[PDB]
Amino acid sequence: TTDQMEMFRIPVTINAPLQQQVFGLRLQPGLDSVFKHTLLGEILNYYAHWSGSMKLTFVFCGSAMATGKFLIAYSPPGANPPKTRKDAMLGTHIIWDIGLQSSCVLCVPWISQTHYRLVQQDEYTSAGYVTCWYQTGMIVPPGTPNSSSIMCFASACNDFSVRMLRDTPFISQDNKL
Amino acid sequence: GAQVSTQKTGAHEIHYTNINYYKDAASNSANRQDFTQDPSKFTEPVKDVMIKSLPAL
Amino acid sequence: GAQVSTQKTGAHEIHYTNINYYKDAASNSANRQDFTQDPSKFTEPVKDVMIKSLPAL
Amino acid sequence: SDRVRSITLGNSTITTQECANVVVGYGRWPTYLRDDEATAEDQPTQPDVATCRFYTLDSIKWEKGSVGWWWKFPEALSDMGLFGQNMQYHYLGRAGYTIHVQCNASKFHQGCLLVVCVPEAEMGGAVVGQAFSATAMANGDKAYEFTSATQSDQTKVQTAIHNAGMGVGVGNLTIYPHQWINLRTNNSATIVMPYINSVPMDNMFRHYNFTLMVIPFVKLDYADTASTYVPITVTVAPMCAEYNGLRLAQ
Amino acid sequence: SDRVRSITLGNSTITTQECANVVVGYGRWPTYLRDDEATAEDQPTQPDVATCRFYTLDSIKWEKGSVGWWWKFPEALSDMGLFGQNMQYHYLGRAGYTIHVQCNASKFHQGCLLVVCVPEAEMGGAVVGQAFSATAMANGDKAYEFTSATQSDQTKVQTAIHNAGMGVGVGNLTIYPHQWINLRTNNSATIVMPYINSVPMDNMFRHYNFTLMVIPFVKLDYADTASTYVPITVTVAPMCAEYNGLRLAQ
Amino acid sequence: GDVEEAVVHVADTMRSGPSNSASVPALTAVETGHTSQVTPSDTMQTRHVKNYHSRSESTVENFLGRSACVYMEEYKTTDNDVNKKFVAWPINTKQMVQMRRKLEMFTYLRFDMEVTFVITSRQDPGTTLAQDMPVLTHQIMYVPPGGPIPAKVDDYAWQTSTNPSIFWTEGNAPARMSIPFISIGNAYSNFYDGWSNFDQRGSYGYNTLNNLGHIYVRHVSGSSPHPITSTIRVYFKPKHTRAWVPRPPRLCQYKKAFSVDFTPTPITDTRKDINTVT
Amino acid sequence: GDVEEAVVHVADTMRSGPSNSASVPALTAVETGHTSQVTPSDTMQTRHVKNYHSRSESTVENFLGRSACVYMEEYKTTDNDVNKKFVAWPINTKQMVQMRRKLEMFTYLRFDMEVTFVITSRQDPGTTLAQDMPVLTHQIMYVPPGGPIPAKVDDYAWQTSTNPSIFWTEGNAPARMSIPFISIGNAYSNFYDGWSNFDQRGSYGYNTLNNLGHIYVRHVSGSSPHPITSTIRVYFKPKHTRAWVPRPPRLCQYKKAFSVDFTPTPITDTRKDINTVT
Numbered sequence A: 001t002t003d004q005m006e007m008f009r010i011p012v013t014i015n016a017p018l019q020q021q022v023f024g025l026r027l028q029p030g031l032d033s034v035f036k037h038t039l040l041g042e043i044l045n046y047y048a049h050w051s052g053s054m055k056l057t058f059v060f061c062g063s064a065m066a067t068g069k070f071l072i073a074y075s076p077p078g079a080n081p082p083k084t085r086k087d088a089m090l091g092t093h094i095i096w097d098i099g100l101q102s103s104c105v106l107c108v109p110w111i112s113q114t115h116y117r118l119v120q121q122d123e124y125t126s127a128g129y130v131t132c133w134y135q136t137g138m139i140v141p142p143g144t145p146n147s148s149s150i151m152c153f154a155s156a157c158n159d160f161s162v163r164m165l166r167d168t169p170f171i172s173q174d175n176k177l
Numbered sequence B, C: 001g002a003q004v005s006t007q008k009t010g011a012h013e014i015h016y017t018n019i020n021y022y023k024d025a026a027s028n029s030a031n032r033q034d035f036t037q038d039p040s041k042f043t044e045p046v047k048d049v050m051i052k053s054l055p056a057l
Numbered sequence D, E: 001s002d003r004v005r006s007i008t009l010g011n012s013t014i015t016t017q018e019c020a021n022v023v024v025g026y027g028r029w030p031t032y033l034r035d036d037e038a039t040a041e042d043q044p045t046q047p048d049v050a051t052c053r054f055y056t057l058d059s060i061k062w063e064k065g066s067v068g069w070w071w072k073f074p075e076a077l078s079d080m081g082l083f084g085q086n087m088q089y090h091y092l093g094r095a096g097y098t099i100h101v102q103c104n105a106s107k108f109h110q111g112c113l114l115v116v117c118v119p120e121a122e123m124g125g126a127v128v129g130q131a132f133s134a135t136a137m138a139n140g141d142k143a144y145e146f147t148s149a150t151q152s153d154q155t156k157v158q159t160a161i162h163n164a165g166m167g168v169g170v171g172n173l174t175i176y177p178h179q180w181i182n183l184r185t186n187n188s189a190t191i192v193m194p195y196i197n198s199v200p201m202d203n204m205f206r207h208y209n210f211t212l213m214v215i216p217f218v219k220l221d222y223a224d225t226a227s228t229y230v231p232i233t234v235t236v237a238p239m240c241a242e243y244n245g246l247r248l249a250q
Numbered sequence F, G: 001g002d003v004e005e006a007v008v009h010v011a012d013t014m015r016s017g018p019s020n021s022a023s024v025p026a027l028t029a030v031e032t033g034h035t036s037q038v039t040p041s042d043t044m045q046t047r048h049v050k051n052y053h054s055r056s057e058s059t060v061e062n063f064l065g066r067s068a069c070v071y072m073e074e075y076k077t078t079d080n081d082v083n084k085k086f087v088a089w090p091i092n093t094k095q096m097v098q099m100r101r102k103l104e105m106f107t108y109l110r111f112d113m114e115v116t117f118v119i120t121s122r123q124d125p126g127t128t129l130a131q132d133m134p135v136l137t138h139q140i141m142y143v144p145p146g147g148p149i150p151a152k153v154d155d156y157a158w159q160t161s162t163n164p165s166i167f168w169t170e171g172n173a174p175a176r177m178s179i180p181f182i183s184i185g186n187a188y189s190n191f192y193d194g195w196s197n198f199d200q201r202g203s204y205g206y207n208t209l210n211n212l213g214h215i216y217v218r219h220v221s222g223s224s225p226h227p228i229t230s231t232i233r234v235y236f237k238p239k240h241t242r243a244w245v246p247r248p249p250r251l252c253q254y255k256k257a258f259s260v261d262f263t264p265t266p267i268t269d270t271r272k273d274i275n276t277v278t
C-alpha cells in the first residue's frame, strides 16, 4: 500500500470468476493487525480478558446502478480455515443483497468453551475466521466504472465486557520528554 | 455515624463498614461502586427514533 | 454494622466482633468456620441404595 | 412495502429486496407426519436445524442461446451436509422444501424465465424402446441441459424443449406450482413445496419426488454493455424433515 | 432379583443376566445445559437417538501375561456413526457417557479387573524433557498396552503399570469412579459418567475429557481347558449430547 | 443513627426460532451515523442464556483509579552547583507517556487527586566512603502560582507559613496527601485549540492553561562529608472522576512535553495478501 | 442495625449387645464400587460413648489456608549485566514442590489469593566495604498478559499508569495485597489433558492454560558504590476455597516445572517376609 488510505477499501470487479473469495481474516480483535488499532481494539488492549458477541457491518460504496450479492460466513475454530465457498457456507453466514439499503450487519455469536477469552490469544483460545465470497457477482450497465469498493465497521454488542486491567503495549518511550 | 453496604462478590454463590474521619469531602475513599451507564448518547444520536425491525429508510 | 459470633473453644468447659473495611469482598478474612460435610458422594455412588444389614447381592 | 421478503431457516437467512409473493404448493404448508397416518412402528428422528437450512447448489450461466435446465430432487442434495448423511443412513425419509431461484440484471436487460416444480416428472428415452442408465437424468447437483433440436443419442433422455421431455405441451406447465422471473419487475422466485406422494414415506435414493425446471420463454437480450452473461443460482432448504429405519450407510 | 439389569438407549439395548449395581459418577446424573449457565449465544442442536446409542468399540484378548489397557474419550468415538460427524462439524460439544465393559468366563476361571474412569488423565513422556506426538496416547478406537517394565522409547508415553503413567500409586485409583469385575461373582461393570470440566462446553478434538483404564490386579489363571483366552469388550453410549458452533468439516 | 444501610448484569439472550417475514433487522443504513442495535438473536436461532457478567471494571472511576508515576528527579545532598541540590518542577501531567495517553482519551476531566511520594537515597561512588550519617529528612513544598520561589537550599522561602509542606523521614511509609478540584474552570481540559492573545498570536495549545504551580524538594539539613544522591517519584491517583467528550486514542509516538507535534505513522501492520489468514 | 449475630461433632457410639440373627452386616461385596458403612457397634459389643471430637482442622479451607513460598530470586543493585539487576518471573504455581503437591490433590480450584513479599538485602563480599548508604526502596510491578515489558532497570515501562505496583522500604512490615479470582474459566485447572492446536498438535499440558502474566522487581534508585544483593520471596495463601474432583496424591518426585514427567518408583518399602512384624 503506497497510499495509506487504500487500507480501508476492499476491491470488487465485474466479470469475476465464479465463487471467488473477497477477503479473509482471523478473529483476534486485540491481537490481529486488522483489529489492532480500531476503536474497539484500542479499548481491549487495556485489558486481558474479553467476552461477548461482535458486529461487523459492511457498506457498498459502488454506483447506484450496480448490483450484486455476497456471502459472508463466520467459521468457528477448527483444524483448517475454509478454502472454497462450499466449505464456508456450512458455518454461520448471511446472504447479503445490495439494493436501496446499502448496509448489512453480520452478528458474530459468542461460541466458546470458556466464559472468557484472552486478549493475547493463542491456540487454546482461538476464535475462528471470517470470510466473504461472491454469491452471484457484480453486474453493471453501460457507462459505469468497472470497479467498486466496500468498507467494514466493527463494534461490540450489548453483552460485551472486559476484565483485568493491564497496561497497553502500543506506546513506549526511551527518555524523559 | 457508620455506613454499611454490600461488597462485590460472586454470583450464584457480605457487608463492610465505613466511617469518614476528615472534614473535607476530598479525603473520602474512591466511590467505585457505581455501575449505571447509558450508551444511547453515542450510538443513537439521531433525531427521529428508528425501529430496528423497520427499514432504515 | 458489626458481626458478632462465637469462637472455637473447648467442649464441656466467648464472642468476637468483626467489621469489614474494604469495598471488595476479596479483602475479607478467611471464612474458616464452616464445618458441613457429606461423604456419600464418594462412598455410596451406586444407583440403588443398599441396606447394610441386608446382603449386598 | 411488500416487495421485500426475508426467510430464516436454521442458521441461514435469505433477503430479497425486490420480489413477488411466495407461492405455497397446493395451498398446503409442510408439516410433520401425524400419528393416525403413519405406518412404521419405531421412533423417527427429527434433526431440525441440522438439516432444515438453505444449501446453495452450484450456478449456471445464462447466455443468449440458452434453452433451459432441470434438477431432480432430493437426489440433487445427495451430498450436501448432514442432509446427505441422514439420507444415506436411513431407509425412509420425508420432507418438504423451499426453493429460491435468484437472477438479477440491469434495467436495460430483457428476458423472462419460468420456474416450476413438476412432481413425478417421468421422462422418456431419446430412442423409443431403449433403456438408459441413471446418469443421463440425475448426477448430483449438476444441472442438465435441454436441447432445441430433437435428441439422437440413445444414452440420453429426449431433450426436445417444446415437449419438456415428457410428451406434453411446454406451454401447459403452468398447471403445476410455478413463478415467473421477469427482468422488468422481478429478481427471484420462491416456491414452498409440501411432501407429495402416494405413501407416507419413501426412500430418497430410489424415488425422485419432484423435478425443478427453468425455461427461458423470452430469450435474453441486451446491447452495448460489458456484461456477457447473467448468472443464475438455486437455493433449497428442507422443511420438517424426519427420517426412519436406521441401517448401514449405503 | 437385583442381579439382572437392562439398559435401553436409542435403538440399542444391553441385557446382563449377572451384574452388580450401576455406579453413577459423583452422584450426578447427566443432563442438558441450563439457561443460566450457558455462554454461547446461538441455538444448540440436540440430535438425541441419532447420537445417544451404544457403540461397541473393538475387542481385546486377555492372556495370562496381560498388564492392562486404556482408551481416551471422546476421541475414541471419533469415527463412530453420526456422533463422529457431529463432532467433526461443530466447534463445541457436551455429553455424558455410559460405559459398559463385558468379560465372562466359566466357574473354574479366576481373576480380577479394575475398571475406572480418570478425568483429566494427563500423562508424562517416557524420557523426561522430551515431547511426544498425539499418536502414542490416542489413535481412534484401538486400545493401548501398558508395560510391566519401565518404558524406554522416547516416542511413547511411560507405560510403567505400577505408576499408571501418571506418577501416582496404582492402588490409589479407587478414589475415582470405578467397579471391579471379579470372575467369581460378576460379568460386567456399568459406570455413568456426567460431564466434568471447568467450562460449560469444549472442543472434543483438542481436549480428552476422561480416560478409561482396565487393569488386572489378579492375573488370569485356569487349568486343563480348551479356552486359551478371555475376550473383553467395551461399549459406550453418549447421553444428553448437544453441539454448537457449526462450521466446515475438519 | 448509629448506622445507615445503602448488581447490573449485561443483557441476557432470548430464545429465538425460525422466522420468515418482511422484517429485515440485518439490513440498515450507516449513512445516518447511527450504529445498529441488532443482536445475535435477530439473525440465527439461539438458546436462552442468563449472563452474570458485569461491566464493573470498565467504569471510568476504575479505569483511571490507579496511581502512576508522573515525574522523577535527582538531587544531591552536597555539591558545588547550587541548582543541583534541589528540584523545581512545574506541575503538569504530560511528561510520562502512559499516564498521558490514558488521560488524553477524554477532552474534559473533573476529579480529586491523591498524591504519593516515593523517596530513596544512595551513596555516590568515590575513593573514600567510610562515614556514619544519621537518618535523613526531606521537605516537600508546594508553591501556588505567583508565590516566592527559593533560589538556594538554605533560602528564607523554606520557612513556609502559608504554603503547605510535608516533612518526611526515611524508613517510614511513603508520604501522601489529597487535593481538591483546584481549577479555575468547571473542568480540566487536556486540549485547547486556541491562542493566548486576543489577536490570535502568542502561545498556542494546552500550555496556555497550565498554571498549577510548582513543587520544590530539598534535604532539610543533611550535609554529608561525601555526596549522597536522592531520587523522588511522584504518583497521581484521580478520585471521584467525571469525564466528557471521548476522543480516539493517540497513535503516533509522543515527541514534546508541551505540544501535539508528531511524525506520520502507518495505520497498522501489513500481511501477505487480503486472503492470507495463517 | 448496630450489630448482627450469626459445632458438628463426629458420630457417637451406641451400646450394643449379643446378637444372633440372619442379618450379616460384616459380609458385603466391593465389586459394586461401594465402600462399606459398617461400624464397630455391628461386630462386637460396645459401650455408649459420647464423642466431642470435631473435624474442623481438616476442611479444605483450613488445609490450604497457609502461606507457602512459591518463588525466590536474587537481583543486584549495581552490576555490568543489565539482565542481572531485576527479576522477571512468569507466574505459575508449579516451581516449589510442597505447595505444588498440596494443590495437585484436586483437579479444579476456585479461590481468592493473598500475596505477601519478603525482601532482604546483604552486602556482597569484596576488598573494600566501607560505605554509607541510606535505606533502600523496592518496586514490585504486575504486568497482565500482553502489556509492555521493561528491558532495563531504568526503562520507561516502570512509570506504571494502569499496572498495579507496590513501593516498599526496608525496615517495615512485609508488603501484602489481595487478588480476586482472576481466571477466564469457572475454575482454575491443575491438569489439562489436551493440546493447543485443534489439530492435536502443539504444546500439551497445563502449560497451555498458564497465562497469568509476569512480576517485575527492581531497586527504585539505589546505585551503590559497591554491589548490594537482594532476595525476594513470594508467598501465596488461598482464601474462600472450593475444590472439585479429588485425585490421588503424587508418588514420584517432580522433575520438570511445566510437565508431569517422572521416573518409575517402587510402590513402597520392603520387609523381611509377610509375617515379620518386629
Ligand SMILES: CN1CCN(Cc2ccc(NCc3ccc(F)cc3F)cc2)CC1
Pocket: F091, F092, F093, F113, F115, F142, F179, F182, F188, F189, F190, F206, F209, F210, F212, F213, F236
Ligand atoms: C492541561 N491540564 C493540566 C491538568 N491536568 C489534570 C491535573 C490537574 C492538576 C493536577 N495537580 C494539581 C496539584 C495538586 C496538588 C499539588 F501539591 C500540586 C499540584 F500540581 C494534576 C493533574 C489535565 C491537563
Ligand SMILES: CN1CCN(Cc2ccc(NCc3ccc(F)cc3F)cc2)CC1
Pocket: G091, G092, G093, G113, G115, G142, G179, G182, G188, G189, G190, G206, G209, G210, G212, G213, G236
Ligand atoms: C495451571 N494453573 C495455574 C493457576 N494455579 C492457581 C493460581 C492462579 C493464579 C495465581 N496468581 C495470580 C496472580 C495474582 C496477582 C498477581 F499480582 C499475580 C498473579 F500471578 C496463583 C495460583 C492453578 C494451576
